[PDB]
């Protein structure tokens, strides 16, 4: 049995969902099919380009598990609501408030206006220029965060970015890192 990994981005282009799949195994030089519970369709044929397979269609069922069988090579019984990949947040910004001596971090996500995946949990990771791959992480539920000036190194530059997860009825994967943002701190 050959191994693979899939993820489904829901409520992307309007309501058209996109289920992408790729192989776990390193070398698979073949000179892929997923069926299961759907709506208006019984089984659909993936599109083939390089090593990724997705379809963009509106007739999709969110309820019920589906058997994904590779062509029959390998089968996996997975739920469409347990392989969700949110869209990466965007418009990340940090603003220093001189009066309160703090930094307000703000971002946006197209999922807020989505019907199904509307509850997310975001992870904001920020690091200093000097540190070799050390990140301070903060989990949050809103879209705004406040970092105290006293809890930050003075006269230092910080890079910052954010990820998201379904954290309600839906489960899945973490999104991609948003484009980073950079900000400085006053010199005491």
């Amino acid at each position: 049995d050959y191994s693979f990994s899939c993820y489904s981005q829901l409520e992307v282009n309007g309501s058209q969902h996109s289920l992408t799949c790729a192989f776990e195994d390193p070398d698979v030089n073949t000179t892929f099919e997923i069926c299961g519970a759907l709506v208006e369709v019984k089984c659909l044929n993936f599109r083939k380009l390089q090593e990724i397979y997705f379809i963009e269609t509106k007739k999709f069922l969110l309820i019920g598990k589906s058997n994904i069988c590779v062509k029959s090579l390998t089968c996996k019984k997975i739920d469409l609501t347990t392989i969700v990949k949110p869209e990466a947040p965007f418009d990340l910004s940090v603003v220093y408030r001189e009066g309160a001596n703090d930094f307000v971090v703000t971002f946006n996500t197209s999922h807020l206006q989505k019907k199904y995946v509307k509850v997310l949990m975001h992870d904001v990771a920020y690091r200093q220029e000097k540190d070799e791959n050390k990140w301070t992480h903060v989990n949050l539920s809103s879209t705004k965060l406040t970092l105290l000036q006293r809890k930050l190194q003075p006269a230092a530059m910080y890079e910052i970015k954010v990820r998201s997860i379904p954290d309600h009825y839906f489960k899945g994967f973490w999104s991609e890192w948003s484009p980073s943002y950079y900000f400085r701190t006053p010199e005491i």
Partner: antibody
Amino acid sequence: EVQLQQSGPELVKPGASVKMSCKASGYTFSDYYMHWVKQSHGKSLEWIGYIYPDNGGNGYNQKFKGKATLTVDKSSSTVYMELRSLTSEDSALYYCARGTYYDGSYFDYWGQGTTLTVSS
Amino acid sequence: DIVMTQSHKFMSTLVGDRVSITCKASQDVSTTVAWYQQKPGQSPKLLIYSASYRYTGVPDRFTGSGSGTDFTFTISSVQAEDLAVYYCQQHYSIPRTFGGGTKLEIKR
């Protein structure tokens, strides 16, 4: 003192592309964000996007397909490209501005602006 | 986008008089609002940041107040050279959005 010298006025045909320059001088060019702003006929100010000279950036949804910002530290120049020019990007004066030290939030220095005109 | 709306597009005042331009935000932007001054034939000049903080070299007669959604820029004693369009900009989140502007005419 700080100086942001922008390129001269431009005349372009519809559908063609434009490339404006903004040469900075008088400060450490790599430590400050660089933003672009549009001033339409109605005197309204529309942000365009930001770029950090050490690497890069972009912003604003409305200018995603129109604006393309880049930088060159060697000449300390921020360049700004327009793609599918229309009769709306014309009656606009394009400014380059510098974001303040701690953040690019607000802009403390402005260029003189470039007048763009796209007409057959 | 966060929409900034300036109530009055034109304002007239006498020299030595007070003027207060208002600017309302569609969402809460805390105290992070800046005010720019654009004189005829010139580029915008940053006068105020963070609602009430004056930029370096800005005269003291320019002041600012407000928080959340309502903000007010005030000239305590308008002078002849104060002729300009005054803009409010929320420097709180992305995208950065400006106000419509308010042209300050002088009555004589």
